[PDB]
């Protein structure tokens with residue numbers, strides 16, 4: 001026997017590539033500043049800094065952090081307005097040898113206290129006008145106010161803090177556990193941005209994502225580690241689709257990463273500067289991709305916070321989009337294994353849990369040893385390493401691409417049959433008038449489960465037609481018992497569907 005299938009399942013993981021494995025994020029930023037110090041690094045409204053200017057200010061502030069005890073693996077909470085100053089702060093924390101815990105200021109008190117209490121950050125960098133948000137928490141550590149003439153008085157050369165790439169860089173909270181990411185994964189991403197995405201200094205990277213979501217880390221360093229510029233898009237521009245479209249074209253943004261939940265509202269014929277559109281965070285669809293692939297280079301990027309943002313990508317080709325948009329193949333220095341409950345490899349085409357190995361793996365969850373040992377298991381494929389169990393269902397396709405099948409949690413039993421919520425969602429989305437869908441499970445008065453489909457459409461779709469369509473497209477046990485048209489989909493801050501905001505039907509008749 002030749003064991004072809006088994007060999008194929010390993011060949012798909014031949015992704016090794018050279019990258020600065022011993023360098024830190026700030027080291028990489030500094031080496032870019034040195035190459036082109038006078039390149040624009042960051043733009044916000046009518047203000048901007050060159051790589052040199054940004055570097056100097058980060059170095060100055062970092063020297064203040066050093067004296068106040070910020071060092072190896074020290075966590076520094078950051079709570080600042082979306083601005084150039086926010087990014088000076090992030091870089092300053094990294095330069096001081098510490099890690100930052102981003103806290104979005106648009107957040108409620110409760111969340112700021114969990115992050116602060118859980119992370120137990122010894123320092124909180126914020127701004128003068130935001131301190132009232134702080135009077136709603138039991139913080140005891142050093143509260144650093146960011147308005148510095150204080151900073152302009154310090155030396156602006158690169159510091160020489162003994163930092164390793166295995167030191168922590170940032171801690172981002174996911175649905176709530178704080179994920180510890182080291183420098184390594186970003187060092188790897190730098191090379192991916194250059195070699196895979198083809199990002200160069202000529203690019204202008206939009207900064208769309210919330211600072212508390214790793215997509216913002218993705219954008220920030222996509223710009224700052226390649227020599228490109230980063231454009232801080234403000235909330236009021238984002239809250240207005242026509243304003244956002246105008247911003248992109250006026251600022252001549254070339255690369256933007258957006259949630260499919262956002263892109264669905266944009267007109268591709270209005271967008272003119274975008275060269276590369278990356279969607280991530282949730283599933284995109286054949287209809288959406290078909291609508292954009294001829295205008296821009298469309299990339300579907302998949303990955304959990306736990307493996308440093310991105311584990312796989314798929315690029316739309318001139319060719320046929322099928323029933324699903326693949327999440328693609330593992331990026332450089334990343335391995336994917338689709339396995340059963342005991343970590344045994346599934347046959348090609350079989351559904352299993354997507355597990356990730358490689359250079360992007362997080363150190364684990366902050367102060368959660370047991371959950372860490374449960375999710376980051378010993379890698380049976382590359383002994384000596386760890387393997388992250390994503391909780392996602394997926395299957396290997398024929399062509400080396402991975403097909404995402406939904407969260408394992410979203411598998412509900414109805415009438416003794418197995419239903420995956422995401423599958424009902426994607427099928428209903430095929431309807432010519434439906435632009436967005438979401439399916440949820442609820443129990444009726446006899447505690448039995450039933451499906452409820454929520455959809456958005458420009459015009460009112462008669463339920464009779466939704467029922468007929470479902471009858472033709474879905475197995476009986478997968479036909480929603482109720483269809484509910486929403487004016488707009490309720491989203492979380494990260495741009496994902498907020499299931500707990502979808503109205504449950506009143507079964508009282």
Ligand SMILES: Nc1ncnc2c1ncn2[C@@H]1O[C@H](COP(=O)(O)O)[C@@H](O)[C@H]1O
Pocket residue numbers: 174175279280281282283284300301302303304305306327390392404406407
């Ligand atoms: N491109 C994608 N397609 C489908 N689902 C995605 C995609 N990218 C991310 N996700 C989902 O988002 C999860 C990561 O969420 P989090 O780590 O909580 O921010 C992944 O495990 C997926 O379930």
Ligand SMILES: N[C@@H](Cc1ccccc1)C(=O)O
Pocket residue numbers: 214215218257280281282301302303304305308309310
């Ligand atoms: N890491 C993001 C997904 C993502 C992938 C690629 C780029 C940006 C974001 C998440 O947890 O959902």
Ligand SMILES: [Mg+2]
Pocket residue numbers: 174304305306
């Ligand atoms: Mg995750």
